[PDB]
Amino acid sequence: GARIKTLSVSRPIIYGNTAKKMGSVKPPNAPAEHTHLWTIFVRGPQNEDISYFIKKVVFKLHDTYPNPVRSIEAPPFELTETGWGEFDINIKVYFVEEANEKVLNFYHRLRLHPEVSSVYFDEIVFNEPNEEFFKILMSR
Amino acid sequence: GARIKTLSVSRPIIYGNTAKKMGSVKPPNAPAEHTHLWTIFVRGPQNEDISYFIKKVVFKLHDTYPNPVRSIEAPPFELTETGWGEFDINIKVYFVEEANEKVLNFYHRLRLHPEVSSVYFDEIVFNEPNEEFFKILMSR
Amino acid sequence: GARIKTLSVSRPIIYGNTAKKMGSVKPPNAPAEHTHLWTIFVRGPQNEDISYFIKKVVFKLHDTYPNPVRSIEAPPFELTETGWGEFDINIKVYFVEEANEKVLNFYHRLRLHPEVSSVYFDEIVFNEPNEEFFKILMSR
């Protein structure tokens, strides 16, 4: 049989963090009491480009950080920082203009303690994409 | 995890109509009471070919139109006409013979009043396609 | 709209059996009272390679057969035998080790009587595939 259904398009997405206990040499302007180096990221499978449909990723860190809303406007959509505690990060994915989409919000608990990593391989499902954005989606 | 599931393949489809209110100069042969120019269509995104899986499209017009069953047997799957009233069109989609499919029947309210367009970007889901039609679908 | 969802990936699969009445000329070491030739198989659409994700296919036959656990380790993932009766065959599909998947079991009723064929065109859905397995899946 055949039926008309609502159009939807999927995009695999990888996000989370890696973490590292610092040995002896710390980054320059790093607070003295910080114990770990960590990296929060949003990327594609096989580290393929995702910037064709993602314009910008913003990470909201714990308020103890200076300028805690960190906007990354070009790939790699990641941020490496120092710390001493585990906390929630708000990951905001901003799609390219022609998508006419709201910010994709989601959460990640930063893991430092048992290199440690906390990583997720999920799917972004776009409901009812417009013709322009569909083209961009299909460009790969 | 892995599971056996019924096979399903989707094809994006764009259908609907554009309309324009004519001025004092009307096309030759146009009935005097007719106020609008309009086009009913079924197409692919980015106007990509759809005849590889769609053999013909039939637009069933209001019975006040002469020969109201309009069969379009080659792309573009569209017709242009004059009119005064908004009315339902039964769109009949005939898939290529390999599909072994019944006719896909759907409907579209012709819109003339707030160019005016009523256009849908949906998905045709094919349930349990046969091996031969699957190949055609996969060829694109 | 956009939502984060669990990743899943589909691969179409074709499986089942063909059968033929032997009639007059028999195989070399086939049991004398066997009446039919039959082939049990797992394959891809258009007979395309599936060994890129499937490592091994095992056909468990009726225990009236010698060594009824039959392991096919390379494509074509098929087995040709003789017989005189219809019985349940357990098809065990072993995915490539990067999948880190359990065996996928399915049932086939071997059909001999109304060439006779019992063939299915379904879909293997992989839930939460790991990145390395996803890469192999995307190879196509």
What is the DSSP code string of A3-41? EEE--EEEEEEEEEEEEEE--SPPPTT--TT--EEEEEE
Q: What angle do CA C35, C59, C118 make, to 5 degrees?
A: 55
- Is A56:A101 a contact under the CB 8 Å cutoff? no
Distance of alpha carbon C120 from alpha carbon A2, whole angstroms: 19
Q: What residues contact A136, with CB distance under 8 A and at least 6 apart? A: A52, A53, A96, A98, A99
Q: Which CATH architecture has domain A1-140?
A: Sandwich (2.60)
C45:B131 CB<8 A: yes
The Cβ of residue C26 has, within 10 Å, a number of other Cβ atoms equal to 13
- Is A68:A112 a contact under the CB 8 Å cutoff? no
Resolution in A: 2.3
Q: Residue A76, preceding bond cis, omega within 30 degrees?
A: yes
Nearest alpha-carbon partner for A121 in C87, C43, C131: C131
The residue written with tokens 């899943």 in the block is C8
The three state secondary structure string of chain B is CEEEEECEEEEEEEEEEEEEECCCCCCCCCCCCCCEEEEEEEECHHHCCCCCCEEEEEEECCCCCCCCEEEECCCCEEEEEEECCCCEEEEEEEECHHHCCCCEEEEEECCCCCCEEEEEEEEEEEECCCHHHHHHHHHC
Distance of alpha carbon C92 from alpha carbon C74, whole angstroms: 14
- Is A89:A59 a contact under the CB 8 Å cutoff? yes
- Alpha carbon of residue B25 to chain centroid: 29
- Is B16:B119 a contact under the CB 8 Å cutoff? yes
A2:B45 CB<8 A: no
At A14, phi and psi to the nearest 5?
A: -120, 130
- Chains near C with 3+ CB pairs less than 8 A apart are A, B
- Alpha carbon of residue B120 to chain centroid: 10
Q: Which residues of C touch A14 (CB under 8 A)?
A: 131
Distance from CA of A65 to the nearest CA of B (A): 40
- Which residues in chain A (112-131) have CB-CB distances under 8 A to chain B? 128-131
Distance from CA of C127 to the nearest CA of A (A): 10
Sheet holding B104-109, edge to edge: B69-72, B54-60, B88-95, B104-109
- Alpha carbon of residue A102 to chain centroid: 16
Three-class SS of residue C42? strand
C3 touches chain B (CB under 8 A): no
C5:A121 CB<8 A: no
- Is B35:B77 a contact under the CB 8 Å cutoff? no
- Is B67:B20 a contact under the CB 8 Å cutoff? no
